[PDB]
Amino acid sequence: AKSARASRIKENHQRFKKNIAGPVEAARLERLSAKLMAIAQA
Amino acid sequence: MRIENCFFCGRPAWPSKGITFMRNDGKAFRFCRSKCHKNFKMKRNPRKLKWTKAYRKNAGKEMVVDSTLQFAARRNVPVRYNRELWQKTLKAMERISEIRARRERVFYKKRMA
Amino acid sequence: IGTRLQEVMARIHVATPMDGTTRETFIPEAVKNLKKYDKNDPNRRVLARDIEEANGGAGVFNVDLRKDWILENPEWKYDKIPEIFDGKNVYDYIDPDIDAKLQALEEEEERLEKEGFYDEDDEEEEEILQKAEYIREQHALIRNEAKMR
Amino acid sequence: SHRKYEAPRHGSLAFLPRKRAARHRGRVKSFPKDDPKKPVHLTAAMGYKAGMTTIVRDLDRPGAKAHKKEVVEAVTIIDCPPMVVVGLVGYIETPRG
Amino acid sequence: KRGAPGGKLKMTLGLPVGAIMNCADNSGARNLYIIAVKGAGARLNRLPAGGVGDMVMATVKKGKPELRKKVHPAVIVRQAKPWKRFDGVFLYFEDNAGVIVNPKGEMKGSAITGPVGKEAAELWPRIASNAGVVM
Amino acid sequence: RSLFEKPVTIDTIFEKDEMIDVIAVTKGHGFVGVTARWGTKKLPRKTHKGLRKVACIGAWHPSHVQWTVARAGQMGYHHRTSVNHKIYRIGKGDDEANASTETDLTKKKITPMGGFVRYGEVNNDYVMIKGSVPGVKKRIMTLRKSLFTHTSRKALEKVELKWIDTSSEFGHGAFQTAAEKKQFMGTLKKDLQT
Amino acid sequence: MAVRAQFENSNEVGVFATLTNSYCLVALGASENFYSVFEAELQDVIPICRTTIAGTRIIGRLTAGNRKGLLVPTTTTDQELQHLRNSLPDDIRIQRIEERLSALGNVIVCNDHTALIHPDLERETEEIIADVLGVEVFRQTIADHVLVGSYMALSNQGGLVHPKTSIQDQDELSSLLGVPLVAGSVNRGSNVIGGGMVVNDWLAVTGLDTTAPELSVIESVFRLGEGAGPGAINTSMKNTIVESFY
Amino acid sequence: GVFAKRTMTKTRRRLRDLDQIERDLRSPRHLQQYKETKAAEDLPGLGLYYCIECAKWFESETSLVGHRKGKPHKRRLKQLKEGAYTHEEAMAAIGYRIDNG
Ligand SMILES: [Zn+2]
């Protein structure tokens, strides 16, 4: 088995982070920041 | 998902409640709690234990003959989904529950005359 | 004839009905008009494997089970069908002939209301009950005194 | 001499010492790394653990056995009244941290 | 390929090594004595154990005499220890029982007496083909 | 400066279908022997000078007890950070049906019948988290954003709830609402007495 | 038109599929390959439903039906029943039955005209079978096996039975069913015909290990493709069958 | 008395249920299935002396005739006269029914 510290596993995780989870997390961050900025400007 | 009923006592068996006994003849017995499960394993008759719907129906303390009890059944022939049919079914369930409660109160008063 | 040879004889034997009749078949007419699927055909039919491959592959693609539903109105294909209502099963109450039975129930309800089925109904009796309760309290106090002594 | 049969350690040395916590309120040891290109947002919050209950989930997990099926799962409820912001601390970088 | 099946969810194992279960098929054996469990891990002092749907290695203590001299692969189809399925249902059978198979999962017998578990039926297609009722 | 003297609700920091980290102090157990503190094997029955112990704490050199040997001491009340906990619902306290789903139409709140045991009622916004968290009831919990970008499909899954249990946790509660309990039981003696 | 296929590297197609003359039921899996085999053979002529029965994927051995009806066991849920009812047209009657032997694909084998059942089914269950399926019901055992739905594949064209069936038993069964029957095997010598394959009046799907002689036997007995007949077995394929299965 | 009353409620100490006893009395096929789940040579009296009501095998005909005079056999008779509890009675207790169309 490849360990959690394996280089290939790290590269796989980095590609997943850059291409898949990244846009979803970015959209969630935009929505949450817009709501909290609405509170801040209110 | 759906709401079962306890085999022993008849209480509403919600998901992740109780335990099911699988008998080798093909019978599944659902119990709502370990009280009913242990009484079943001790082979106590539910019809004799006064805290059960079985005893209450045997003794005639439950309203059993009424038109409002003919609306709930295990439907073995499925119906194609229809939004208006489900909505009018929901309204029917609410009104039937009200009528059943009122007639049950009348039944209890005729028990306690 | 040896056992193995009778076994292969039973394998090559074809049993037929003695009357010589045949059962009616029910092949639909579109089977004759179907064009056979070819992988190398550029105008081949797009399959669920093709859609799954285009939308993430196996284990990523999420199939839509309600896509092929046949309903009276196709707007209802993605509804959240109710299941539980106030501790009761909706599927227990789903019945195509629900309105007629409910209207009959309403007629029955107004009939018993006119007949007086839900109708609801002495100072001397209240006095004698209060006197009996006072006597029971005095009896309890006497028993408590006896228990103390 | 050596052990005749191998066996792993009982417990983890990563969580030593097994002592009482120095504070009742939990300490955020690390915050997420700051990215100046992101919009401004808060990184944490507080609540009070109320208890747990049960749910039924409609599972959409492709490749799993319970895909398109209902699953019963335990969930924990945390009561979260809104916080009140009352202060602002500034932090500089030093060769000591 | 060893006899440990793939795609099995975690369940409470009720039958350790040394347990005698009933033999639920018509192979001629009446009981099965567990001596090993396929796919068991290595841990000091821990007895290997299996649940419904697992393959075990079992000898025959009671039954047809020419079955009594060999070690057979078997699939546990019923267990008495209660376990939970993913729908939140805790359940149990009234006995522990298994069926003799080969390492490919095909059954030695031709009929199954009584019900089988959903786990065993879903993991072994021949047991699902020879089951009359699945619970 | 814009946020001074202002209330911040939980749904402007966290969102449903997010995986967060939970930081809390664990349940205290006081002074505990090695058997429950570390999971060591019990010694055989009637072992002289105790069997809930470790037989050898240093059979070899150095002439010291080493720091890696299990000892009786404080168990629990430890600081813990547990990661990757999924938010299943952020319910609003002003919603009278925040335990209602799209398929369960019972208008009910998250509080069980009889209240949460040893807590009370949840009357504010609440966060439903899959699984268990390090604290106990009444304990202050810190919810933190995940430090890294997630690598699991579970963090990207969308959660669809069908039913939330609201029966009593003070026993084998079989009813979700008081109306359901009264409908099942029927009319009691105290009902006509009142 | 007999097609070799597999459900997740398993040759037991009849365990995971149910094929009639008006619909097809396929088990939900982690991929679309098993669905797409049936989709390629049936290009929207009859509907294909990805379905689950009792939370399991053994729908072929748990469900029984023909072009007129469908029977599901008592542990089928309301949502699975609603999904099946919404996926199939109103010409097909779907009923959930309370039969003790809930493996309906094991205890019932049927075509559009007749149905053989396990001999210990209930009388009202026989009534429901004869009502919903609209067929004549017979209690019969095939090669001393009470699981007729797993040890026989049946269509309106013909039938393939357990290889160890006696010749007089095949004669009596063929006279009772009105279709020609042949004793043969699937999946390289497996005797579980119903668990190994599914069939309707113009399509058969067997496992990938089904050899060429027994595939030709299936083709001839079920009259699949151009110039296929059960009389070819003892004339044209006789030497091949004797060479292979001696 | 009961042998080993401490483990009397274990699943491995379970006895046959009363509804199964009624079904054995009503239909000999169900009783024959139950008897085929046993081995005849390991039974008391080689399985020749069986009480369906008590669901129990006996070593001799005089032993069977003997237990019939006892009160456990009479308790089983009165329980069968009252009728055992089934799922049909369970549904009738709550007013539930089956709709088969
Ligand atoms: Zn109960």
Automatic annotation (TrEMBL), chain B:
GO biological process, one term: assembly of large subunit precursor of preribosome
Binding site for Zn(2+) 1: C6, C9, C32, C36
GO annotation, cellular component aspect: nucleolus
Disulfide-linked positions: C6-C9, C9-C32
Residues where Zn(2+) 2 binds: C32, C36
Keyword Glycoprotein: no
Spans traversing the lipid bilayer: none
GO MF annotations in UniProt: structural constituent of ribosome
Entry binding sites for Zn(2+) 3: C36
Domain TRASH: 6-44
Keywords, sorted A to Z: Metal-binding, Ribosome biogenesis, Zinc
Family: Belongs to the eukaryotic ribosomal protein eL24 family.
Name of the protein in question: Ribosome biogenesis protein RLP24
Portion held of the full protein: 1 to 113 of 225
Automatic annotation (TrEMBL), chain D:
Binding site for Mg(2+) 2: H2
Residues at which Mg(2+) 1 binds: S1, H2
Residue ranges the record marks as coiled coil: none
Highest taxon of the lineage: Eukaryota
Family: Belongs to the universal ribosomal protein uL3 family.
Protein name as annotated: Large ribosomal subunit protein uL3
Organismal lineage: Eukaryota, Fungi, Dikarya, Ascomycota, Pezizomycotina
TrEMBL record, chain E:
One function term, GO molecular function aspect: structural constituent of ribosome
HAMAP family: Ribosomal_uL14
Protein name: 60S ribosomal protein l23-like protein
Ligand binding (Mg(2+) 1): G41
Region forming the signal peptide: none
Family: Belongs to the universal ribosomal protein uL14 family.
GO cellular component, one term: cytosolic large ribosomal subunit
Organism per entry: Chaetomium thermophilum (strain DSM 1495 / CBS 144.50 / IMI 039719) (Thermochaetoides thermophila)
Keyword terms: Metal-binding, Ribonucleoprotein, Ribosomal protein
GO biological process entries: translation
Keyword field contains Ribonucleoprotein: yes
Automatic annotation (TrEMBL), chain H:
GO biological process: ribosome biogenesis
Family as reported in the entry's similarity comment: Belongs to the ZNF593/BUD20 C2H2-type zinc-finger protein family.
A molecular function (GO) term: nucleic acid binding
Subcellular localization(s) per the UniProt record: Cytoplasm; Nucleus
One cellular component term from this protein's GO annotations in UniProt: nucleus
C2H2-type domain segment(s): 49-78
Protein name in UniProt: Zinc finger domain-containing protein
Keyword Zinc: yes
Keyword Metal-binding: yes
Organism ancestry: Eukaryota, Fungi, Dikarya, Ascomycota, Pezizomycotina
Positions contributing to Zn(2+) binding: C51, C54, H67, H73
Keywords: Cytoplasm, Metal-binding, Nucleus, Ribosome biogenesis, Zinc, Zinc-finger
SMART domains: ZnF_U1
